[PDB]
Write an enzyme that holds these catalytic residues in place. Structure first.
Site, PDB file in Angstrom:
ATOM      1  N   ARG C  30       0.825  -1.214   0.000  1.00 10.99           N
ATOM      2  CA  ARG C  30       0.000   0.000   0.000  1.00 10.99           C
ATOM      3  C   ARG C  30       0.860   1.265   0.000  1.00 10.99           C
ATOM      4  O   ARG C  30       0.427   2.309  -0.496  1.00 10.99           O
ATOM      5  CB  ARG C  30      -0.955   0.012   1.195  1.00 10.99           C
ATOM      6  CG  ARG C  30      -2.165  -0.863   0.992  1.00 10.99           C
ATOM      7  CD  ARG C  30      -3.324  -0.340   1.782  1.00 10.99           C
ATOM      8  NE  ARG C  30      -4.553  -1.064   1.467  1.00 10.99           N
ATOM      9  CZ  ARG C  30      -5.533  -0.581   0.712  1.00 10.99           C
ATOM     10  NH1 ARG C  30      -5.436   0.627   0.180  1.00 10.99           N
ATOM     11  NH2 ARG C  30      -6.625  -1.300   0.496  1.00 10.99           N
ATOM     12  N   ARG C  31       2.069   1.166   0.572  1.00  7.89           N
ATOM     13  CA  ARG C  31       3.056   2.244   0.616  1.00  7.89           C
ATOM     14  C   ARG C  31       3.943   2.172  -0.638  1.00  7.89           C
ATOM     15  O   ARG C  31       4.269   3.211  -1.221  1.00  7.89           O
ATOM     16  CB  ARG C  31       3.846   2.187   1.949  1.00  7.89           C
ATOM     17  CG  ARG C  31       5.387   2.237   1.901  1.00  7.89           C
ATOM     18  CD  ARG C  31       6.034   1.071   2.648  1.00  7.89           C
ATOM     19  NE  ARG C  31       5.332   0.724   3.893  1.00  7.89           N
ATOM     20  CZ  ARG C  31       5.632  -0.314   4.668  1.00  7.89           C
ATOM     21  NH1 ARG C  31       6.636  -1.122   4.351  1.00  7.89           N
ATOM     22  NH2 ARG C  31       4.925  -0.556   5.767  1.00  7.89           N
ATOM     23  N   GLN C  53      -3.773 -12.298  -0.299  1.00  9.15           N
ATOM     24  CA  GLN C  53      -4.167 -12.049   1.093  1.00  9.15           C
ATOM     25  C   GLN C  53      -5.643 -12.396   1.292  1.00  9.15           C
ATOM     26  O   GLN C  53      -5.976 -13.169   2.176  1.00  9.15           O
ATOM     27  CB  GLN C  53      -3.898 -10.571   1.431  1.00  9.15           C
ATOM     28  CG  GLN C  53      -4.281 -10.108   2.830  1.00  9.15           C
ATOM     29  CD  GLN C  53      -5.678  -9.552   2.915  1.00  9.15           C
ATOM     30  OE1 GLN C  53      -6.555 -10.174   3.515  1.00  9.15           O
ATOM     31  NE2 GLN C  53      -5.915  -8.365   2.343  1.00  9.15           N
ATOM     32  N   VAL C  54      -6.513 -11.817   0.447  1.00  7.47           N
ATOM     33  CA  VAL C  54      -7.976 -11.950   0.412  1.00  7.47           C
ATOM     34  C   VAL C  54      -8.379 -13.409   0.313  1.00  7.47           C
ATOM     35  O   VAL C  54      -9.268 -13.833   1.041  1.00  7.47           O
ATOM     36  CB  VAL C  54      -8.586 -11.053  -0.713  1.00  7.47           C
ATOM     37  CG1 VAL C  54     -10.043 -11.394  -0.983  1.00  7.47           C
ATOM     38  CG2 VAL C  54      -8.434  -9.568  -0.381  1.00  7.47           C
ATOM     39  N   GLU C  58     -10.074 -15.914   3.287  1.00  8.12           N
ATOM     40  CA  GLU C  58     -11.297 -16.677   3.007  1.00  8.12           C
ATOM     41  C   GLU C  58     -11.157 -18.132   3.355  1.00  8.12           C
ATOM     42  O   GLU C  58     -12.079 -18.724   3.888  1.00  8.12           O
ATOM     43  CB  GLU C  58     -11.613 -16.634   1.526  1.00  8.12           C
ATOM     44  CG  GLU C  58     -12.256 -15.360   1.026  1.00  8.12           C
ATOM     45  CD  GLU C  58     -12.865 -15.536  -0.353  1.00  8.12           C
ATOM     46  OE1 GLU C  58     -12.913 -16.692  -0.845  1.00  8.12           O
ATOM     47  OE2 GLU C  58     -13.295 -14.513  -0.939  1.00  8.12           O
ATOM     48  N   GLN C  95       3.680 -16.026  -1.978  1.00 10.08           N
ATOM     49  CA  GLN C  95       4.968 -15.676  -2.600  1.00 10.08           C
ATOM     50  C   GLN C  95       4.993 -15.811  -4.158  1.00 10.08           C
ATOM     51  O   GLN C  95       5.687 -15.041  -4.825  1.00 10.08           O
ATOM     52  CB  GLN C  95       6.106 -16.490  -1.948  1.00 10.08           C
ATOM     53  CG  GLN C  95       6.467 -16.024  -0.529  1.00 10.08           C
ATOM     54  CD  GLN C  95       7.465 -16.905   0.196  1.00 10.08           C
ATOM     55  OE1 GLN C  95       8.095 -16.486   1.173  1.00 10.08           O
ATOM     56  NE2 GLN C  95       7.612 -18.156  -0.221  1.00 10.08           N
ATOM     57  N   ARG C 104       1.488 -19.113  -8.752  1.00  5.55           N
ATOM     58  CA  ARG C 104       0.659 -19.404  -7.578  1.00  5.55           C
ATOM     59  C   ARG C 104      -0.105 -20.745  -7.705  1.00  5.55           C
ATOM     60  O   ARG C 104      -0.413 -21.334  -6.684  1.00  5.55           O
ATOM     61  CB  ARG C 104      -0.281 -18.219  -7.238  1.00  5.55           C
ATOM     62  CG  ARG C 104      -1.772 -18.405  -7.535  1.00  5.55           C
ATOM     63  CD  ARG C 104      -2.257 -17.313  -8.457  1.00  5.55           C
ATOM     64  NE  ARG C 104      -3.688 -17.393  -8.758  1.00  5.55           N
ATOM     65  CZ  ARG C 104      -4.223 -18.165  -9.701  1.00  5.55           C
ATOM     66  NH1 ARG C 104      -3.460 -18.974 -10.419  1.00  5.55           N
ATOM     67  NH2 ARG C 104      -5.529 -18.146  -9.917  1.00  5.55           N
TER      68      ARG C 104
END
Ligand SMILES: O=C(/C=C/c1ccccc1)N1CCC2(CCCC(=O)N2c2ccc(Cl)c(F)c2)CC1
Ligand SMILES: O=C(/C=C/c1ccccc1)N1CCC2(CCCC(=O)N2c2ccc(Cl)c(F)c2)CC1
Ligand SMILES: O=C(/C=C/c1ccccc1)N1CCC2(CCCC(=O)N2c2ccc(Cl)c(F)c2)CC1
Ligand SMILES: CCCCCCCCCCCCCCCC(=O)O
Ligand SMILES: CCCCCCCCCCCCCCCC(=O)O
Ligand SMILES: CCCCCCCCCCCCCCCC(=O)O
EC number: 4.4.1.20
Lengths: 143, 143, 143
Positions: C30-31, C53-54, C58, C95, C104
């Site tokens: 985000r940064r 992440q999302v 879940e 990762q 992934r």
């Protein structure tokens, strides 16, 4: 110790498999609309199938928490019954949303009813747990 | 067996109802901004109320896992206390985000503190469980 | 009572910390891309780190449910082993996605294998629980 929770363990396992089905449905819609991950946006139908999944995923721990607390503090069979009602209402919710965002409302409200039912039974089970000791210690003020 | 977990069951039920409140808040923002599902995008305020919900929903099983492990391997009352702190910080988090995405930071960090506190107490409870047996078997190497 | 679940409590705590790591990774992205909340959209890399992440978020309660049911109705050590396999596959999943949405797939399928393995062991544990009583009462029809 495991017998008194075996119906809740069964209903939990059903819920897990119901979520695996919803993930398969979203995977199938990703090929049926050529929606490449990490995109969540497509036609007014990919988004519905996908959102129905996202919602059920969110509501799953709420179901698990209530099913287990109601099952341990009120009847396990009763909690296992609402647990089956909720899960079945969710299949209908998904199937309804997978058509129109209107046809999901009725099985969505059916799911809500079963969720509030588990909350009430968990609440009544804990009330009946703490209240007699409170009423006893409270009335123990006469001296 | 159920008495030693009754505070954790109470705090879990509070968390479930706190999530039902967040869902009502998002339902109310959907009418207050005419955001039709499956859309998640609207003004810089519908998205904030909605994201605050989405975040709390994600973090709920992390709360449940820690509350229960800390409550069973370290004091149940202590875990039930941080569990109340976390949940209360979350109401403030939601209420802050529902204003600006800045006013959510302070109750967000308060929620983090309570989450790390539960993690530490669960860690200390398991450490104290496995470590003496390890130290014993390790020192059992002298022969 | 707590000893027979201490490995599942350990593996749960590992999962919680793995999720805290994923949240740190999204906070850092985000940064590293100036993505202000409540926005979830940015370059084809912020979305990948964020979606990884999302997804893990879940799938976490599905992991918790299966780890605990398999750990209590089939061997706790066996469930704790697949629980470690799943979690490790998830770090690789994250990762891999944090690089390309292709890299992934392999650790995603490794995670799936461990999830179905826990489901089977939970299923076999409950089967072995209910089936003998059923077979007994069913064969009790001769009269
Ligand atoms: O073959 C499937 C579909 C199975 C299915 C779904 C609905 C009806 C009938 C069959 N899939 C692969 C693995 C799948 C996603 C990829 C990652 C993962 O963890 N998965 C997962 C594995 C185990 C569990 Cl118990 C779980 F809930 C999820 C689910 C979908
Ligand atoms: O009346 C409400 C609002 C209740 C409320 C919320 C905050 C403060 C005071 C009152 N709602 C309907 C059912 C609701 C969504 C629709 C589907 C569903 O499952 N729901 C659900 C049902 C039971 C539980 Cl225990 C749960 F967590 C969720 C929640 C919102
Ligand atoms: O310092 C961190 C990062 C820690 C980290 C992550 C990965 C590898 C090594 C270190 N963070 C702040 C608090 C954090 C988000 C803000 C709100 C919150 O609840 N958090 C939370 C607190 C406790 C737990 Cl056990 C949890 F899972 C989440 C996590 C990230
Ligand atoms: C996260 C859902 C609640 C977990 C259920 C805890 C029940 C423990 C049984 C104590 C006897
Ligand atoms: C998913 C949160 C953890 C569930 C708590 C398990 C505690 C079982 C009690 C064993 C005695
Ligand atoms: C939400 C995950 C399941 C919680 C595990 C419940 C196990 C209770 C132990 C009964 C003995």
């Amino acid at each position: 110790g495991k017998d008194e929770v075996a119906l809740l363990a069964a209903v939990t396992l059903l819920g897990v498999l119901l979520q695996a089905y919803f993930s398969l449905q979203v995977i199938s819609a990703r090929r049926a609309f050529r929606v490449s991950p990490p995109l969540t946006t497509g036609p007014p139908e990919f988004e519905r199938v996908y959102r129905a999944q996202v919602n059920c995923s969110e509501y799953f721990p709420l179901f698990l928490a209530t099913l287990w607390v109601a099952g341990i503090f009120f009847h396990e069979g009763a909690a296992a019954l609402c647990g089956l009602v909720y899960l079945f209402a969710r299949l209908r919710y998904f199937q309804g949303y997978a058509r129109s965002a209107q046809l999901r409302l009725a099985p969505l409200y059916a799911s809500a009813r079963a969720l509030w039912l588990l909350v009430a039974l968990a609440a009544l089970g804990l009330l009946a747990h703490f209240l007699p000791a409170a009423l006893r210690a409270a009335l123990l003020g006469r001296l």
